[PDB]
Design an enzyme around this catalytic site. Structure first.
Site, PDB file in Angstrom:
ATOM      1  N   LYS E 156       0.464   2.896   7.278  1.00  0.00           N
ATOM      2  CA  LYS E 156      -0.543   3.423   8.181  1.00  0.00           C
ATOM      3  C   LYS E 156      -1.888   2.740   8.074  1.00  0.00           C
ATOM      4  O   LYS E 156      -2.649   2.785   9.036  1.00  0.00           O
ATOM      5  CB  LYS E 156      -0.773   4.913   7.952  1.00  0.00           C
ATOM      6  N   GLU E 182     -10.650   8.492   1.645  1.00  0.00           N
ATOM      7  CA  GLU E 182      -9.546   7.605   1.285  1.00  0.00           C
ATOM      8  C   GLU E 182     -10.003   6.706   0.139  1.00  0.00           C
ATOM      9  O   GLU E 182     -11.065   6.924  -0.445  1.00  0.00           O
ATOM     10  CB  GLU E 182      -9.057   6.832   2.514  1.00  0.00           C
ATOM     11  N   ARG E 183      -9.188   5.712  -0.216  1.00  0.00           N
ATOM     12  CA  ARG E 183      -9.440   4.919  -1.413  1.00  0.00           C
ATOM     13  C   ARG E 183     -10.624   3.991  -1.210  1.00  0.00           C
ATOM     14  O   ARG E 183     -10.697   3.287  -0.206  1.00  0.00           O
ATOM     15  CB  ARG E 183      -8.207   4.101  -1.771  1.00  0.00           C
TER      16      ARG E 183
HETATM   17  N1  ADP Z   1       3.988  -5.945   7.477  1.00  0.00           N
HETATM   18  C1  ADP Z   1       4.209  -4.910   6.643  1.00  0.00           C
HETATM   19  N2  ADP Z   1       4.960  -3.860   7.023  1.00  0.00           N
HETATM   20  C2  ADP Z   1       5.280  -2.802   6.258  1.00  0.00           C
HETATM   21  N3  ADP Z   1       4.694  -2.738   5.024  1.00  0.00           N
HETATM   22  C3  ADP Z   1       3.934  -3.704   4.497  1.00  0.00           C
HETATM   23  C4  ADP Z   1       3.621  -4.883   5.300  1.00  0.00           C
HETATM   24  N4  ADP Z   1       2.839  -5.672   4.556  1.00  0.00           N
HETATM   25  C5  ADP Z   1       2.671  -5.032   3.374  1.00  0.00           C
HETATM   26  N5  ADP Z   1       3.312  -3.853   3.338  1.00  0.00           N
HETATM   27  C6  ADP Z   1       3.345  -2.924   2.186  1.00  0.00           C
HETATM   28  O1  ADP Z   1       3.482  -1.576   2.604  1.00  0.00           O
HETATM   29  C7  ADP Z   1       2.516  -0.771   1.946  1.00  0.00           C
HETATM   30  C8  ADP Z   1       1.898   0.208   2.931  1.00  0.00           C
HETATM   31  O2  ADP Z   1       0.797   0.842   2.295  1.00  0.00           O
HETATM   32  P1  ADP Z   1      -0.514   1.124   3.150  1.00  0.00           P
HETATM   33  O3  ADP Z   1      -0.104   1.033   4.579  1.00  0.00           O
HETATM   34  O4  ADP Z   1      -1.533   0.148   2.641  1.00  0.00           O
HETATM   35  O5  ADP Z   1      -1.039   2.610   2.796  1.00  0.00           O
HETATM   36  P2  ADP Z   1      -0.438   4.035   3.266  1.00  0.00           P
HETATM   37  O6  ADP Z   1       0.020   4.712   2.011  1.00  0.00           O
HETATM   38  O7  ADP Z   1      -1.647   4.706   3.849  1.00  0.00           O
HETATM   39  O8  ADP Z   1       0.696   3.780   4.210  1.00  0.00           O
HETATM   40  C9  ADP Z   1       1.465  -1.703   1.371  1.00  0.00           C
HETATM   41  O9  ADP Z   1       1.261  -1.436  -0.012  1.00  0.00           O
HETATM   42  C10 ADP Z   1       2.031  -3.080   1.465  1.00  0.00           C
HETATM   43  O10 ADP Z   1       2.295  -3.561   0.155  1.00  0.00           O
HETATM   44 MG    MG Z   2      -3.604   4.279   3.438  1.00  0.00          MG
END
Ligand code: ADP
Ligand code: MG
Lengths: 127, 467, 54, 127, 471, 127
Positions: E156, E182-183
């Site tokens: 997200k 958030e963080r």
């Molecule tokens: N293109 C991508 N699609 C899906 N996940 C990804 C992609 N690139 C990185 N990620 C990983 O998926 C995780 C999603 O976490 P993030 O979206 O940052 O926070 P949240 O917990 O709010 O969803 C990230 O830590 C990342 O390492």
């Molecule tokens: Mg997040």
């Protein structure tokens, strides 16, 4: 009859309805409930009642009092709150199954789960 | 009994401060200065000459200071022989607007149970006349029944056929007590009862005494409807000595309304959300239905099982009092069999040879057996084939087909619909007919001639006429 | 020969995967029913004790 | 429109937000809670409202009032507190699922889990 | 100053004050004296004998009873205007980026009312972002409201920082990012991901974004009012200037959840599972000020945390009505490597309609969703019968459905540090044409690994030739 | 360390025992219970802790402060109250299981589920 050298017997029917009529008496005075809204001391209700069935030695008369409590279970749960407050008090159990009673074996006593911890050492040599 | 000003109105809970004549608990008050009667039933005492009570109509337009009297008794209701064919709510007022109920003496709705030395000690069997109910799950006298099966099964036609059988051989009138019922369906019940013959708007030839507490009436006035339909039911036990019936629709809305009263006062709830006094409140109602030395009260109660949970706290507590069950299921209506009674899932606690005898037990255990294996080999004949079952399995096809059509019966209250005359069979005519199908004396009869007849001599008679 | 016997043991060993599944959901309806009732009671004591602690 | 020989039809959309609007008002007036923190008189909300829909007769005018109340469940759970009051009051339900909505059946009506209690009397002689 | 009250009872983050002369109304601001930092308390209840019950906006350490409390005469007054662009701001409207003060000539008190029924623009549009699941299956709308659901760790903050790249650079109107708890790590990337990308310019006056940041190291009375400092800057751009705005909020579940942290300390009986009894009232007071009136427009994108992947929780399930478009990310899909994780059978828009998007866009996206619900009825057969028992028609279904499932995935540009691929941005006319052909049968002769992580369908045959040359 | 230049590391063993010391200490101060009798701000209890684990810029000193909170869960269920409140504060996780430990994979790390925001992928060049 115990303390005068005579032999007694008492049968309760049943101790799960003394516990729903003590839960009512303790909810209405606003005491904190527990598992299945039972009060904190639904054990001491039944332990101090069933501690009184004893056999006295020959100084004190040699009389006896035997207690056979009764519990009702809900569709066969022998891990509910109240049937594990009395199983951990009495010296044995006599399980009756609702499956064996409908099939035809009556008295439907489950012989694999009915024990006696102390009544093995006291029965007739002919048997 | 004195005058007390009001001092608090919160919801369906009124608070009345008397001066001298402090009423006992369960005393009915009457508010003065209003349009129609607003009663209040005293439930606690709080000290400082203050009681607290549960209102039984709408609590609007009540001013802090109104003067409310005291009847000096509980809710007193018109109890008589001229109350049959009428309708009244929880506090005795007529609501069919046919004229006021002109009666002589009144009775309060709160009493105590029968005494320890007033009971009866020899169990007897109340015959109704229905073929499946007399045999495979017999009613006691003084006993309690459960009726399972909602709308669309052939249910109200069973209720009216009970009332047109209890007054043709036994002579005891009945009560209907709808607890929290629908106002839309209280009128199709009234208007079907008129055209069927149990209530008659002209004369002294009625059988039922409707007591309708309905769904838009406050929770304090929904619990007390089974007591007002019990209080009427005792004049035909105490003061007349007959075999009363009593229908409650249904036993869950009695229980659910007790949990609403108990939570408006402030009491901390039990297991899954019900009231702490759940078994005593059912106790003081269900213990007043016994078989005393003068007469008896029988009861028939419909049960709703919430979330398909047969170990829920409300149907667990109700099953502790039952002496029978009746199950109406959707599938037996499709076969064409009336009433829709499931003879494998309907029980009776007095099914035992010491109570019903030796002849009645070894037939209702025999005809209970022949319908169990047919449900088993309703799969072998459904996959493998027909002629591949044995020659001794061409008799468990016959004698489990000839029997489950002789569990059907032309009712009398639906006289114009079927066009056939309503038949009654006594209890020795149920037993004389079921024994001869397992014995196979009538093995040469087609499975359609066992349909909607009375005695054994009619099925045979019906077969001869055919073709 | 080996085609009839491969089919009639594909019928009998599927009846016994269907009997062994009826005994596993009826033991899991009961565990579900007790676990449903014990979360109605759990959340309700959280409210009864949340009002009376005020 | 009911007292005057005319007809009407009302659509409450939805009745699962009146019952939450009452609950906010009770628990700030410190009325005692019940199951799911609803007050005790919340069957009394939807019973005195949904019984004003009537079909009057010839001596009162011949009016009518039909009511379609809307209730939203949460993941097929028709056994929560408010969805079990209002199923008991009304005269039938029409049950729409989101599995049938994506398999190509729109309007997404389940026929098996829907009923009308009146039914065949409330139809024309050709339908 | 008026009604200089005095403090009596600091129990948690709920301070009660007592006024000698003048009682202030509900929803005001109070200024605790004698502190080197600015602590602001907002009035919430009136108790009797001239005592009110407030809520602090900072730390309650060092609060000695008998301490004076001033009064301003209004709710909290933030800065607003055009000069708030390329800035980061506090809940009470202060700088937190160490660039100096905000020099504006107009203040807006953060408590306003929802615009009436006769100020409601009715028109729908379409909006193209570039993603083959958004633009095909749950299309956006110019001025609509958009919510991004899903659990923790499903994608997200990536899907919301990719739409900031796609839409909020090729846009003429302005944007606001409000960070509601958030963080603080993730609030340092997006400050620096957009300095090098031109959206923030630290020397001249051509920035096109404004930032509001109150994070999860903050007391739970200040994590309930950065949701409202957001849509007060994002309303001056819609009402006063006749412009067009974009609204980005992450995360809006921390507005509800920080109201359950001071419910019982205020004096209420708690409702069902632990939330305050004013859930759907304090929420709908806020989610009606985010609307498009007939003076401007707002396109709002809000991230919505679903706690413990439980969608029937009362904090998400009362937010499904304040939104036009839902994109629900699942976790059982992102475990298969498919990215974006978006559930095809659970996202939904209002304008999926054969009179706005056209009767060719509509016939495609109602055959993608119909072949994916046909897949799941076969997956219960495969678990017993195995794959080589099925018939030859049902084998054709699973192969296309796995081709469609892999083709819904697309490499974002912000996954150029995670996966090492290169980013796509597919136009809408190619999205409809590509999916129309996989359902027809015109790519039945390829391996599935061609379709994984491509853009247009012409790149998914330029991979099946490289796999066959390196064989 | 972190506010003077160096690099620190901190292990909380564990943080499911800093919560039941807050539930007891703040029930005897007569504060009303929330879920599982935990207070209102158990999320604020852990969040104001796990955000000091910074990585400062190089014009302050450049020091770092890693953190490794341990959490014990009951019966391997990760959807509890105190687990999910602290899953969503940390960048990544290491899911230790039991069937990995007993089949033989020791250290029993679920490498399928042990996701990690890779930390600008500072693994190292040869690895
Ligand atoms: N293109 C991508 N699609 C899906 N996940 C990804 C992609 N690139 C990185 N990620 C990983 O998926 C995780 C999603 O976490 P993030 O979206 O940052 O926070 P949240 O917990 O709010 O969803 C990230 O830590 C990342 O390492
Ligand atoms: Mg997040």
């Amino acid at each position: 009859f115990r303390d005068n050298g005579k032999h007694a017997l008492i049968i309760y029917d049943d101790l799960s309805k003394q516990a729903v009529a003590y839960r009512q008496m303790s909810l209405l005075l606003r005491r904190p409930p527990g598992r299945e809204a039972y009060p904190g001391d639904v054990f001491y209700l039944h332990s101090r009642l069933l501690e009184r069935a004893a056999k006295m030695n020959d100084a004190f008369g040699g009389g006896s009092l035997t207690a056979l409590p009764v519990i009702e279970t809900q569709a066969g749960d022998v891990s509910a709150y109240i049937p594990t407050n009395v199983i951990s008090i009495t010296d044995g159990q006599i399980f009756l199954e609702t499956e064996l009673f409908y099939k035809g074996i009556r008295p439907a006593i489950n012989v694999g789960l009915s024990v006696s911890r102390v009544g093995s050492a006291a029965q007739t040599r002919a048997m | 009994a004195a005058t007390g000003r009001i001092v608090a109105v919160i919801g369906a809970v009124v608070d009345v401060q008397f001066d001298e004549g402090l009423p006992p608990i369960l005393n009915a008050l009457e508010v003065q200065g209003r349009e129609t009667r607003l009663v209040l039933e005293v439930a606690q005492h709080l000290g400082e000459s203050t009681v607290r009570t549960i209102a039984m109509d709408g609590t609007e337009g009540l001013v802090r200071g109104q003067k409310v009297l005291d009847s000096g008794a509980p809710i007193k209701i018109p109890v008589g022989p001229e109350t049959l064919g009428r309708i009244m709510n929880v506090i005795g007022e007529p609501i069919d607007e046919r004229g006021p109920i002109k009666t002589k003496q009144f009775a309060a709705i709160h009493a105590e149970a029968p005494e320890f030395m007033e009971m009866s000690v020899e169990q007897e069997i109340l015959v109704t006349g229905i073929k499946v109910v007399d045999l495979l799950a017999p009613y006691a006298k003084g006993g309690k029944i459960g009726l399972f099966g909602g709308a669309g099964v052939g249910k109200t036609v069973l209720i009216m056929e009970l009332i047109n059988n209890v007054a043709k051989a036994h002579g005891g009138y009945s009560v209907f007590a709808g607890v929290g019922e629908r106002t839309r369906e209280g009128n199709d019940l009234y208007h079907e009862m008129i055209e069927s013959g149990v209530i008659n708007l002209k004369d002294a030839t009625s059988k039922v005494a409707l007591v309708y507490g309905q769904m838009n009436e406050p929770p304090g006035a929904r619990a007390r409807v089974a007591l007002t339909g019990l209080t009427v039911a005792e004049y035909f036990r105490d003061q007349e000595g007959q075999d009363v019936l009593l229908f409650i629709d249904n036993i869950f809305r009695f229980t659910q309304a007790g949990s609403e009263v108990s939570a408006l006062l402030g009491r901390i709830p039990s297991a899954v959300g019900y009231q702490p006094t759940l078994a005593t409140d059912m106790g003081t109602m269900q213990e007043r239905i016994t078989t005393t030395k003068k007469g008896s009260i029988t009861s028939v109660q419909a049960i709703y099982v919430p979330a398909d949970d047969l170990t829920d706290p409300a149907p667990a507590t109700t099953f502790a009092h039952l002496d029978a069950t009746t199950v109406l299921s959707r599938a037996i209506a499709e076969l064409g069999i009336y009433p829709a009674v499931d003879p494998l899932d309907s029980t009776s606690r007095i099914m035992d040879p010491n109570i019903v005898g030796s002849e009645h037990y070894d037939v209702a255990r025999g005809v209970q057996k022949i319908l169990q294996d047919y449900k088993s080999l309703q799969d072998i004949i459904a996959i493998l084939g027909m002629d591949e079952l044995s020659e001794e399995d061409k008799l468990t096809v016959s004698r489990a087909r000839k029997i489950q059509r002789f569990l059907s019966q032309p009712f009398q209250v639906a006289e114009v619909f079927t066009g056939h005359l309503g038949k009654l069979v006594p209890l020795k005519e149920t037993i004389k007919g079921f024994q001869q199908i397992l014995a196979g004396e009538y093995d040469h009869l087609p499975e359609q001639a066992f349909y909607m007849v009375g005695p054994i001599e009619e099925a045979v008679a019906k077969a001869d006429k055919l073709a | 020969e080996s085609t009839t016997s491969e089919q009639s043991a594909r019928m009998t060993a599927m009846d016994n995967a269907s009997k062994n599944a009826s005994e596993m959901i009826d033991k899991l309806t009961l565990t579900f029913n007790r676990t449903r009732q014990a979360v109605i009671t759990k959340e309700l004591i959280e409210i009864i004790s949340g009002a009376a602690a005020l």
